[PDB]
Design a protein around this nucleic acid. Structure first.
Ligand SMILES: [Mg+2]
Ligand SMILES: [Mg+2]
Ligand SMILES: [Mg+2]
Ligand SMILES: [Mg+2]
Ligand SMILES: [Mg+2]
Ligand SMILES: [Mg+2]
Ligand SMILES: [Mg+2]
Ligand SMILES: [Mg+2]
Ligand SMILES: [Mg+2]
Lengths: 62, 68, 206, 140, 142, 141, 100
RNA sequence: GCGAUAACGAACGAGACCUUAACCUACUAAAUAGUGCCACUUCUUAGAGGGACUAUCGAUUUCAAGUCGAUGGAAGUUUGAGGCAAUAACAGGUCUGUGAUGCCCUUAGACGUUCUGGGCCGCACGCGCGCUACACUGACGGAGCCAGCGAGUAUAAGCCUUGGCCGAGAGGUCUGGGAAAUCUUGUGAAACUCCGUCGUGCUGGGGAUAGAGCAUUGUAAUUGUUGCUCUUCAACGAGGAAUUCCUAGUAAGCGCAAGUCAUCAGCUUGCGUUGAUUACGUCCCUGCCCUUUGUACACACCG
């Protein structure tokens, strides 16, 4: 039960070494419940990156 | 980066303050005009000056610019 | 369809390429589709090529790698470990033979099997480290589609390389076995053990 | 003389000069037929300018290229560029420009290096290291 | 093409007091014999008309004796002098090719022949150091 | 159409001309072909002991055909390769001079070569005739 | 008539091209057929030394250069005419050699 | 640089600049370059120029400096790479580069100069820069067969050396070319590709150590100068703690030339062949800079 979320806004580089990015995701179906999540690899807007678990927000990384 | 220096920024705004009626929004024409208006030692500096003069003219046509 | 007679005679099979551009003039991209919505834009199969050797400039900008053919990214990743750097013709030979073995086995389209193994080998959540100046700390984060694809290619070629090291089995058929196993999701294969262990640690950090 | 156009294609150091004369579909590499250009595995790089447009464009023209310098791969890319540019220059000079722009459209939509030479050259080596950016290992 | 045989294969060979693996190709099997390298075995096999496509056990006794005959008498079979192991011998001046047991005997005799005259090379052999002028400051650490 | 040497693949043209020249049998093979190494950089004699001289003479003949008055030193450079110096880096080393010089002398007295003006060895009037013949009889199959 | 070759060599191109043009001019107003000038590929005499007179510091190197420019001009004229043209176009920096 | 502004307007440094690379069917010519059939300058050379200035269009931004996307373009990372490079300063290194030097020492049984021989190479050991490898993405064997940067002599004290002929090789000999876009040299380089043998084995991986012999340079090769032939067949089965370099024709391989040089390159300085993985971000470590701050420091915390 993976959920797909297109990214609509790239928030910014976070983490100690800057290797992880805060990004703003929007769900493909039920276009609401917009969430802030962290991503490891390089990210542009309009990435359909999938989420193993959905019920969790994200904050700054140490 | 592509940040122009003061030797091109002030030389371009002297051109605008001195030959605004003769200037235009075309780089090729501005490039030829500044070659007969100013004594530029190098072609690269001439093109940089004309490209920023063209940018400033394009910005002046959209409204008043500060400092010129 | 007509055969065009030139003063310099041109073989029949290559004259057949006028109808369609095919990988090694043998494999078609038309009936190949990525079984994942999130990696469609990062697995490039829309522009057919004849040979996986284009000598393009995909390292200039940030996301130019997504425009390189997925098979060319695989043959680029094959040439590793010092003694093989720069040996692209050898890598292309390996890929060309591997595709034929993937064709005689399971009879599917070899580049469809390649696409399935790449979509099936990339971990969807990786546990990045957030250690504060020495202390051990891990946080589970998502994996971008580009890094998911190119980590799939890295793991697929690493697994084929290690399976072919000090083994009578040749590299082309170690790559063929690795690609087939990852395409069908078998846990016996490398890059599926790695993918499961990666997503397991990420599950143990969120 | 006759309808002849002369062009050249380039890669890193390899340069191939193509002579395109009016005749039959004769296409030679240093006096040798193109069906046996080496290496064999890259033969479709020079087959691309042929099969992309269709061999019928070469009925009235014969192309003979002379490639020197560079290496094996750089010579293959120089040859395929010289062939594509010779065909374009012939269409531009002795055929309507609509066909020349058509050919240029398919060529550009497929591969930029068919008409535009790749500008990458080797960076010079700098002292203090064995390469352009690489440096000698430092010890403390 | 693949062929079959029964009772002709010999698992273990014994040539010149050396045990030879019968499943090694003959040219590289003979290299077990001290004093016989790949280059020498290739030539004794071509002088003995033993085609190289045979394993060691494939050979018959007639061929094995013809080979040990050639190895023991190389100059008699149009093998050039410069191709031999021990040419212009110290005592009798003739060209030789030493084999399994003669090799270490004449190597020893060369060591004592140098040490008896107390040459510098013989001295360094006595000391156990490198004799060919190599630096020993940093690599003679074994 | 007239088939030439440049119109046939080199690898199977040489494989066909070596066979023809051996069955023809007039090429004189020196007595050391079963002993010698092709190059000082080589470590082993050729694996095709019976046919390597014929194939090498065929290669030399074709190479001279496509060029003009190539000498024997250039042939040594052509057939030389990287030597396996033990711990020192690799280096290019020339092939044996005698084998190539014997090959060109054998082809010159078999009628394929001759002493060219301003040095070297040109290909003969019949050398073109019979190489172009082998080229024609090579690629029809 | 005489086929005469004039070779011009120098390190600096401004005086070399001045002498070359002056010779072409004198071979022009005099109706003397000419071939040239032919600009030979310039020779870069490169010397790469160590900066340090001693042997201490970071290993930094100078790379000095000496460009040599060569021009050859073919004239079909009598030797007296060509030689007096040379004295007309004599220059300290550029050296001239005349060969019949 | 924009901007904020008790500052305003400037100078040095940065940038401009200069050298080099990428474009020019647009000029000027070329039997020392190439081509077509004498002609011509596409390729080659080099001199006079042109070309790019982030050009145009979209986004964001204080709508500013700019940045990110596209399109065109040879080139849109300062277009790529370098050369030059401020204010002070260091007990940094060199008086073993100097007929650069002050002073001290020595100056005839010399610490001057020269000759012979030895040493700088010496080996229980610790350390640094590297070269080969541990194999099959491989070793050999044939065959295919492609670069660029350069260097090269005379009555010497002998340069680069083709071509012929000997020689298994290394090498020898006889002629000729080149003071060089002309000859070496298309430096026919190596990786590389095809066709065969090998078959997971310390094996045909690896080539140390050592024995015998043949040549080259040199007055002189012993403490093997170096090359070649046969033989000897070592550790090494991918390397601990640690630690280096690197963002595109880059890294990595792969060779080639030049310097040193009578001989000797596992070294440097360059050059080209094949040619990627992964960022295009951050201050977590490290180093440096700036601001605030404390100071009993100013020879400045080695206080
Ligand atoms: Mg710069
Ligand atoms: Mg001094
Ligand atoms: Mg002395
Ligand atoms: Mg010393
Ligand atoms: Mg170092
Ligand atoms: Mg060249
Ligand atoms: Mg040298
Ligand atoms: Mg040194
Ligand atoms: Mg204070």
């Amino acid at each position: 039960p993976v959920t797909l979320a297109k990214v609509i806004k790239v928030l910014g580089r976070t983490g100690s070494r800057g290797g992880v990015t805060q990004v703003r995701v929007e769900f493909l179906e039920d276009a609401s419940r917009t969430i802030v999540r962290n991503v490891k690899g390089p990210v542009r807007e309009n990435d359909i990156l999938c989420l193993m678990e959905s019920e969790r927000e994200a904050r700054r990384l140490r | 980066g592509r940040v122009r220096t003061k030797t091109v920024k002030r030389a371009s705004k002297v051109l605008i303050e001195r030959f605004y009626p003769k200037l235009t929004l075309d780089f090729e024409t501005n490039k030829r005009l500044t070659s007969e208006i100013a004594v530029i030692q190098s072609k690269r500096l001439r093109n940089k000056i004309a490209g920023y003069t063209t940018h400033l003219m394009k910005r002046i046509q959209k409204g008043p610019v500060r400092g010129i | 369809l007509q055969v065009v007679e030139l003063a310099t005679t041109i073989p029949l099979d290559v004259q057949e390429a006028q109808r369609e551009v095919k990988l090694f003039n043998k494999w078609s991209f038309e009936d190949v589709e990525v079984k994942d919505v999130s990696l469609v834009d990062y697995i490039q199969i829309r522009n057919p090529v004849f040979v996986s050797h284009t000598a393009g400039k995909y390292a200039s900008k940030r996301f130019r790698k997504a425009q390189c053919p997925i098979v060319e990214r695989l043959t680029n990743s094959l040439m590793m470990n010092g003694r093989n750097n720069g040996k692209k013709l050898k890598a292309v030979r390996i890929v060309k033979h591997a595709l034929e073995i993937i064709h005689v086995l399971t009879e599917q389209n070899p580049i469809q099997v390649v696409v399935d193994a790449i979509v099936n080998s990339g971990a969807r959540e990786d546990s990045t480290r957030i250690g504060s100046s020495g202390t051990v700390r891990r946080q589970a984060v998502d994996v971008s589609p580009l890094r998911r694809v190119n980590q799939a290619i890295a793991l697929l070629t690493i697994g084929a390389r290690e399976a072919s090291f000090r083994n009578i089995k040749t590299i082309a058929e170690c790559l063929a076995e690795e690609l087939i196993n990852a395409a069908k999701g078998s846990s016996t294969s490398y890059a599926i053990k790695k993918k499961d262990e990666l997503e397991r640690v990420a599950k143990s950090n969120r | 003389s006759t309808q002849s156009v002369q062009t050249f294609g380039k890669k890193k150091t390899a340069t191939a000069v193509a002579h395109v004369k009016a005749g039959k579909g004769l296409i030679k590499i240093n006096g040798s037929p193109i069906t046996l250009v080496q290496p064999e595995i890259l033969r479709f790089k020079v087959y691309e300018p042929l099969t992309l447009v269709g061999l019928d464009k070469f009925q009235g023209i014969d192309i003979r290229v002379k490639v020197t310098g560079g290496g094996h791969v750089s010579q293959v890319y120089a040859i395929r560029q010289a062939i594509a540019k010779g065909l374009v220059a012939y269409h531009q000079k002795y055929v309507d420009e609509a066909s020349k722009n058509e050919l240029k459209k398919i060529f550009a939509s497929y591969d930029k290096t068919l008409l535009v030479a790749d500008s990458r050259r080797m960076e010079p080596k700098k002292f203090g290291g064995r390469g352009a950016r690489a440096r000698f290992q430092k010890s403390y | 093409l693949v062929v079959q045989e029964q009772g002709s294969f010999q698992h273990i060979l014994r040539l010149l007091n050396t045990n030879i693996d019968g499943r090694i190709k003959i040219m590289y099997a003979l290299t077990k014999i001290r004093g016989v390298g790949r280059r020498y075995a290739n030539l004794v096999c071509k002088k003995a008309d033993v085609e190289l496509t045979k394993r060691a056990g494939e050979l018959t006794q007639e061929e094995l004796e013809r080979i040990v005959t050639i190895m023991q008498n190389p100059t008699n079979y149009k093998i050039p002098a410069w191709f031999l192991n021990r040419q212009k011998d110290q005592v009798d001046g003739k060209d030789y090719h030493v084999l399994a047991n003669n090799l270490e005997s004449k190597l020893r005799d060369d060591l004592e022949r140098l040490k008896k005259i107390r040459s510098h090379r013989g001295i360094r052999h006595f000391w156990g150091l490198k004799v060919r002028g190599q630096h020993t400051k940093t690599t003679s650490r074994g | 159409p007239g088939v030439s040497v440049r119109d046939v693949p080199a690898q199977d043209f040489i494989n066909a001309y070596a066979q023809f020249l051996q069955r023809q049998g007039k090429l004189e093979v020196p007595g050391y072909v079963d002993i010698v190494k092709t190059s000082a950089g080589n470590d082993l004699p050729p694996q095709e002991a019976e046919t390597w001289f014929y194939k090498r003479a065929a290669s030399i003949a074709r190479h001279i055909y496509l060029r003009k008055q190539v000498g024997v030193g250039a042939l040594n450079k052509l057939y030389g390769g990287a030597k396996n110096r033990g711990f020192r880096p690799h280096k290019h080393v020339d092939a044996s001079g005698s084998i190539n010089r014997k090959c060109v002398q054998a082809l010159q007295k078999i009628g394929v070569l001759e002493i060219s003006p301003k040095g070297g060895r040109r290909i003969s009037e019949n050398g073109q005739r019979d190489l172009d013949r082998i080229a024609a009889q090579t690629l029809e199959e | 008539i005489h086929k005469i070759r004039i070779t011009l060599t120098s390190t600096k191109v401004k005086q070399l091209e001045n002498v070359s043009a002056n010779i072409i001019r004198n071979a022009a107003q005099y109706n003397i057929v000419k071939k040239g000038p032919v600009r030979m590929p310039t020779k870069v005499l490169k010397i790469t030394t160590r900066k340090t007179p001693n042997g201490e510091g970071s290993k930094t190197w100078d790379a000095y250069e000496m460009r040599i420019h060569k021009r050859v001009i073919d004239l079909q004229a009598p030797a007296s005419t060509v030689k007096r043209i040379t004295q007309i176009t004599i220059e300290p920096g550029v050296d001239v050699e005349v060969t019949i």
